[PDB]
Amino acid sequence: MEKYNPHAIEAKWQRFWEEKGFMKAKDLPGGGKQYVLVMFPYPSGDLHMGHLKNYTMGDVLARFRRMQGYEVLHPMGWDAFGLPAENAALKFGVHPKDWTYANIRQAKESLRLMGILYDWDREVTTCEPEYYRWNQWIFLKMWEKGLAYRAKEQWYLRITAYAERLLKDLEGLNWPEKVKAMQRAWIGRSEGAEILFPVEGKEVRIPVFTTRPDTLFGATFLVLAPEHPLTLELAAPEKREEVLAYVEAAKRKTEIERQAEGREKTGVFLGAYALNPATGERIPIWTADYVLFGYGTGAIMAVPAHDQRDYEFARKFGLPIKKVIERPGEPLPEPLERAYEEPGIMVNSGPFDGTESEEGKRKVIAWLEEKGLGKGRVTYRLRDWLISRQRYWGTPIPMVHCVVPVPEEELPVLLPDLKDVEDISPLEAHPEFYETTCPKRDTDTMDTFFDSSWYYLRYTDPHNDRLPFDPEKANAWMPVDQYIGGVEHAVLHLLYSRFFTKFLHDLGMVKVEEPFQGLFTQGMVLAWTDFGPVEVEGSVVRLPEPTRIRLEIPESALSLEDVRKMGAELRPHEDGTLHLWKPAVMSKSKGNGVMVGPFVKEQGADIARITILFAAPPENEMVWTEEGVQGAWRFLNRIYRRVAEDREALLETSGVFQAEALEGKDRELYGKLHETLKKVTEDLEALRFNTAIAALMEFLNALYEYRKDRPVTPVYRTAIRYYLQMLFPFAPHLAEELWHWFWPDSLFEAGWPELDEKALEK
Ligand SMILES: [Hg+2]
């Protein structure tokens, strides 16, 4: 009897599935659908098992949903723009376009060889004009809606205008809490307050914003930015000269060097005074370079005792320092050597004395609103999105500097046609490019994050040359049911995407306001890596510089316990010394990547898929090991052997039987079959792919145990049929192969087995 052999059968089925177009997505789903999306990769060459873990996950879900009868959209594309292609050009002296298309061909083959099936008709390549013309289109619509502006002097997207919705809409979002929390923390909603300071002898009252209203009684002076309209106006007669000069000198500088840590503290007393609303005390008004006009109201109240910058300023110019916050368990030192910036208890704050700091902010705000001295104001840490880039390989900003927007019908604004590779601001060295008539071209390209903030919508209508996409098509496929990928480092991408969707929704183009209904997070794939020799003495491990550098840690010494805790192990080398080994993120740089092409050629696709899928929960990190590979071989070998051994008998057997009439082991098998179907189905729907495989391994053992006592029976034949259907999503090639031994059509046409509720009883 022969044995399982991945070679030949896999290439056979891969072509079969493609030609049959089983995974082609309909233009408009009708009565349900499933949109399975995996984060598209940067076209940087051949992929390794780390990348394939995500793509395999997507293929499993897609095949499963397809078998259930859903209309499935599982597309692949390329995040082609960016620096990678540019660095390559400067290295190999090749056009970025050529390097990209070559890498695309390789990655595509790697995906195909793993048995991954996409609707390639919906392929997108971001570096193509057919795609980035729509980036420019969207950019104009944002400009037209006041969401895109220029500021000193690059372009920005007013994402902060959606800060509140980006935060609020998270509540109804069914994502992992850890991801939602990272979104919340990045946006950073904070409770603040705008306080009004009356100016002695003047009509004007100076507005000041602060997140520490709890320290109001400690405000000993005000500080206006030099560019503040009140700096010169309030400047006393015998101070206007000095102030005027300072203001001018301030402009000659930049906000970076003004807010630069280390520089000496400079400033000028305006000769004018303000009244502290809380104490009614008279405080001097100053102007200083460290205060910028762009933030808050361009003016701040200074609380030396609780803000280190104000402390240094007060100390340098001899300004009063008043303590109003203390630690709960001890009074502050006297005199004060530095500012105490942490929460505590309010003191020297009139009626607020003894009030806990955080709660005190609310009391003071509420107090200010009642007396009409100030109001609560919400602030966000989230800043606007800087999209301007001085690079060649990117989407050109559709703007002209006569600042006029390029006409919608004149789009796209194509990139210059080089002559040199070193020729790559890059757009500035192209006179025949920026030289145009007013309706000079902008010489900046868009941050590639712009490209990826809506690619999932383009997939719904990839060939539309009139709009980024037809609302009808997009609304039919959206939202994405499961977005697959690592999130640990995708805070921005997720935020930017949600932003784009909400904007496109405001334009009436998208029904939903949240692009990803579900996040299928994937942990990193690791691989045992040799970091170098070490020297051990007692419980201490000395790390030679080369070894320590590869590990990227500050310790030149580790305890045996530290080594264990990090998941490392000291292993004897033939060189006669011990080396420190440890699972490390699989990446080309680390030189620990397991390339798809080579592996599949030497082993197989199903073997790789099972190795990845069974290693651990998808959300957890996993280590690719030869042990896992052999375990995969063993499992596939046993499935093949079981069916091969009973092939002759199975052929002469009918699968028709009466469940109620089953007895003994036959009835026991029927029960186990359906319990397995339930576990596998629910594990798949819950994204617990490793446990689904475990259930299949367990049921395979039950099949072997059954055949010890019973022959090939109708119920057994049905169990084999169901098994192959349940196996298809995980190891599609072997499943399809064995299926054709007894059945005519493809597993894609067999559907998903129907669960028998009653069989689960008792
Ligand atoms: Hg391109």
JSON list of N, CA and C in Angstrom, two decimals, residues 81-109:
[
{"chain": "A", "resi": 81, "resn": "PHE", "atom": "N", "xyz": [3.43, 51.28, -2.94]},
{"chain": "A", "resi": 81, "resn": "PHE", "atom": "CA", "xyz": [4.20, 52.50, -2.75]},
{"chain": "A", "resi": 81, "resn": "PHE", "atom": "C", "xyz": [4.99, 52.42, -1.45]},
{"chain": "A", "resi": 82, "resn": "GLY", "atom": "N", "xyz": [5.86, 53.39, -1.22]},
{"chain": "A", "resi": 82, "resn": "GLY", "atom": "CA", "xyz": [6.64, 53.39, 0.01]},
{"chain": "A", "resi": 82, "resn": "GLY", "atom": "C", "xyz": [8.15, 53.42, -0.20]},
{"chain": "A", "resi": 83, "resn": "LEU", "atom": "N", "xyz": [8.88, 53.49, 0.90]},
{"chain": "A", "resi": 83, "resn": "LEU", "atom": "CA", "xyz": [10.34, 53.54, 0.89]},
{"chain": "A", "resi": 83, "resn": "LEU", "atom": "C", "xyz": [11.06, 52.28, 0.40]},
{"chain": "A", "resi": 84, "resn": "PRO", "atom": "N", "xyz": [10.56, 51.09, 0.79]},
{"chain": "A", "resi": 84, "resn": "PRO", "atom": "CA", "xyz": [11.19, 49.83, 0.37]},
{"chain": "A", "resi": 84, "resn": "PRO", "atom": "C", "xyz": [11.63, 49.82, -1.09]},
{"chain": "A", "resi": 85, "resn": "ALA", "atom": "N", "xyz": [10.71, 50.15, -1.99]},
{"chain": "A", "resi": 85, "resn": "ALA", "atom": "CA", "xyz": [11.02, 50.17, -3.42]},
{"chain": "A", "resi": 85, "resn": "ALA", "atom": "C", "xyz": [12.08, 51.22, -3.76]},
{"chain": "A", "resi": 86, "resn": "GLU", "atom": "N", "xyz": [12.10, 52.31, -3.00]},
{"chain": "A", "resi": 86, "resn": "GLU", "atom": "CA", "xyz": [13.08, 53.37, -3.23]},
{"chain": "A", "resi": 86, "resn": "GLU", "atom": "C", "xyz": [14.48, 52.98, -2.78]},
{"chain": "A", "resi": 87, "resn": "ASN", "atom": "N", "xyz": [14.58, 52.33, -1.62]},
{"chain": "A", "resi": 87, "resn": "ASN", "atom": "CA", "xyz": [15.87, 51.90, -1.12]},
{"chain": "A", "resi": 87, "resn": "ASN", "atom": "C", "xyz": [16.46, 50.85, -2.05]},
{"chain": "A", "resi": 88, "resn": "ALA", "atom": "N", "xyz": [15.59, 50.02, -2.62]},
{"chain": "A", "resi": 88, "resn": "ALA", "atom": "CA", "xyz": [16.01, 48.98, -3.54]},
{"chain": "A", "resi": 88, "resn": "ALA", "atom": "C", "xyz": [16.63, 49.61, -4.79]},
{"chain": "A", "resi": 89, "resn": "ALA", "atom": "N", "xyz": [15.97, 50.64, -5.31]},
{"chain": "A", "resi": 89, "resn": "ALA", "atom": "CA", "xyz": [16.45, 51.34, -6.49]},
{"chain": "A", "resi": 89, "resn": "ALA", "atom": "C", "xyz": [17.85, 51.89, -6.26]},
{"chain": "A", "resi": 90, "resn": "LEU", "atom": "N", "xyz": [18.07, 52.51, -5.10]},
{"chain": "A", "resi": 90, "resn": "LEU", "atom": "CA", "xyz": [19.37, 53.07, -4.76]},
{"chain": "A", "resi": 90, "resn": "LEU", "atom": "C", "xyz": [20.40, 51.97, -4.50]},
{"chain": "A", "resi": 91, "resn": "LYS", "atom": "N", "xyz": [19.93, 50.75, -4.27]},
{"chain": "A", "resi": 91, "resn": "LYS", "atom": "CA", "xyz": [20.83, 49.64, -4.00]},
{"chain": "A", "resi": 91, "resn": "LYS", "atom": "C", "xyz": [21.19, 48.86, -5.26]},
{"chain": "A", "resi": 92, "resn": "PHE", "atom": "N", "xyz": [20.17, 48.35, -5.95]},
{"chain": "A", "resi": 92, "resn": "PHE", "atom": "CA", "xyz": [20.39, 47.58, -7.16]},
{"chain": "A", "resi": 92, "resn": "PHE", "atom": "C", "xyz": [20.40, 48.43, -8.42]},
{"chain": "A", "resi": 93, "resn": "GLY", "atom": "N", "xyz": [20.11, 49.72, -8.27]},
{"chain": "A", "resi": 93, "resn": "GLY", "atom": "CA", "xyz": [20.09, 50.59, -9.43]},
{"chain": "A", "resi": 93, "resn": "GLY", "atom": "C", "xyz": [19.04, 50.16, -10.44]},
{"chain": "A", "resi": 94, "resn": "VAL", "atom": "N", "xyz": [17.87, 49.79, -9.94]},
{"chain": "A", "resi": 94, "resn": "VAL", "atom": "CA", "xyz": [16.77, 49.35, -10.78]},
{"chain": "A", "resi": 94, "resn": "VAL", "atom": "C", "xyz": [15.55, 50.23, -10.53]},
{"chain": "A", "resi": 95, "resn": "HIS", "atom": "N", "xyz": [14.72, 50.40, -11.55]},
{"chain": "A", "resi": 95, "resn": "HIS", "atom": "CA", "xyz": [13.51, 51.20, -11.42]},
{"chain": "A", "resi": 95, "resn": "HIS", "atom": "C", "xyz": [12.63, 50.57, -10.34]},
{"chain": "A", "resi": 96, "resn": "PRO", "atom": "N", "xyz": [12.08, 51.39, -9.43]},
{"chain": "A", "resi": 96, "resn": "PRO", "atom": "CA", "xyz": [11.22, 50.87, -8.36]},
{"chain": "A", "resi": 96, "resn": "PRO", "atom": "C", "xyz": [10.02, 50.10, -8.89]},
{"chain": "A", "resi": 97, "resn": "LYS", "atom": "N", "xyz": [9.53, 50.50, -10.06]},
{"chain": "A", "resi": 97, "resn": "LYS", "atom": "CA", "xyz": [8.39, 49.85, -10.69]},
{"chain": "A", "resi": 97, "resn": "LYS", "atom": "C", "xyz": [8.72, 48.39, -11.05]},
{"chain": "A", "resi": 98, "resn": "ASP", "atom": "N", "xyz": [9.91, 48.18, -11.59]},
{"chain": "A", "resi": 98, "resn": "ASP", "atom": "CA", "xyz": [10.33, 46.84, -11.99]},
{"chain": "A", "resi": 98, "resn": "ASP", "atom": "C", "xyz": [10.57, 45.94, -10.80]},
{"chain": "A", "resi": 99, "resn": "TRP", "atom": "N", "xyz": [11.22, 46.49, -9.78]},
{"chain": "A", "resi": 99, "resn": "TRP", "atom": "CA", "xyz": [11.52, 45.74, -8.57]},
{"chain": "A", "resi": 99, "resn": "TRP", "atom": "C", "xyz": [10.21, 45.30, -7.91]},
{"chain": "A", "resi": 100, "resn": "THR", "atom": "N", "xyz": [9.22, 46.18, -7.94]},
{"chain": "A", "resi": 100, "resn": "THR", "atom": "CA", "xyz": [7.92, 45.90, -7.35]},
{"chain": "A", "resi": 100, "resn": "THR", "atom": "C", "xyz": [7.16, 44.80, -8.08]},
{"chain": "A", "resi": 101, "resn": "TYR", "atom": "N", "xyz": [7.07, 44.91, -9.40]},
{"chain": "A", "resi": 101, "resn": "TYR", "atom": "CA", "xyz": [6.35, 43.91, -10.18]},
{"chain": "A", "resi": 101, "resn": "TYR", "atom": "C", "xyz": [6.99, 42.52, -10.14]},
{"chain": "A", "resi": 102, "resn": "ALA", "atom": "N", "xyz": [8.31, 42.48, -9.93]},
{"chain": "A", "resi": 102, "resn": "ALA", "atom": "CA", "xyz": [9.02, 41.21, -9.85]},
{"chain": "A", "resi": 102, "resn": "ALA", "atom": "C", "xyz": [8.66, 40.56, -8.51]},
{"chain": "A", "resi": 103, "resn": "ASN", "atom": "N", "xyz": [8.71, 41.36, -7.45]},
{"chain": "A", "resi": 103, "resn": "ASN", "atom": "CA", "xyz": [8.38, 40.87, -6.11]},
{"chain": "A", "resi": 103, "resn": "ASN", "atom": "C", "xyz": [6.93, 40.41, -6.05]},
{"chain": "A", "resi": 104, "resn": "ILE", "atom": "N", "xyz": [6.06, 41.07, -6.80]},
{"chain": "A", "resi": 104, "resn": "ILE", "atom": "CA", "xyz": [4.65, 40.72, -6.83]},
{"chain": "A", "resi": 104, "resn": "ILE", "atom": "C", "xyz": [4.48, 39.33, -7.43]},
{"chain": "A", "resi": 105, "resn": "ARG", "atom": "N", "xyz": [5.23, 39.05, -8.48]},
{"chain": "A", "resi": 105, "resn": "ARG", "atom": "CA", "xyz": [5.15, 37.76, -9.15]},
{"chain": "A", "resi": 105, "resn": "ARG", "atom": "C", "xyz": [5.57, 36.64, -8.20]},
{"chain": "A", "resi": 106, "resn": "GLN", "atom": "N", "xyz": [6.64, 36.87, -7.44]},
{"chain": "A", "resi": 106, "resn": "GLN", "atom": "CA", "xyz": [7.13, 35.88, -6.48]},
{"chain": "A", "resi": 106, "resn": "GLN", "atom": "C", "xyz": [6.14, 35.64, -5.34]},
{"chain": "A", "resi": 107, "resn": "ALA", "atom": "N", "xyz": [5.68, 36.72, -4.72]},
{"chain": "A", "resi": 107, "resn": "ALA", "atom": "CA", "xyz": [4.74, 36.61, -3.61]},
{"chain": "A", "resi": 107, "resn": "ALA", "atom": "C", "xyz": [3.48, 35.89, -4.05]},
{"chain": "A", "resi": 108, "resn": "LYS", "atom": "N", "xyz": [3.04, 36.19, -5.26]},
{"chain": "A", "resi": 108, "resn": "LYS", "atom": "CA", "xyz": [1.84, 35.59, -5.82]},
{"chain": "A", "resi": 108, "resn": "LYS", "atom": "C", "xyz": [2.00, 34.07, -5.93]},
{"chain": "A", "resi": 109, "resn": "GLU", "atom": "N", "xyz": [3.17, 33.64, -6.39]},
{"chain": "A", "resi": 109, "resn": "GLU", "atom": "CA", "xyz": [3.45, 32.22, -6.55]},
{"chain": "A", "resi": 109, "resn": "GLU", "atom": "C", "xyz": [3.48, 31.55, -5.17]}
]
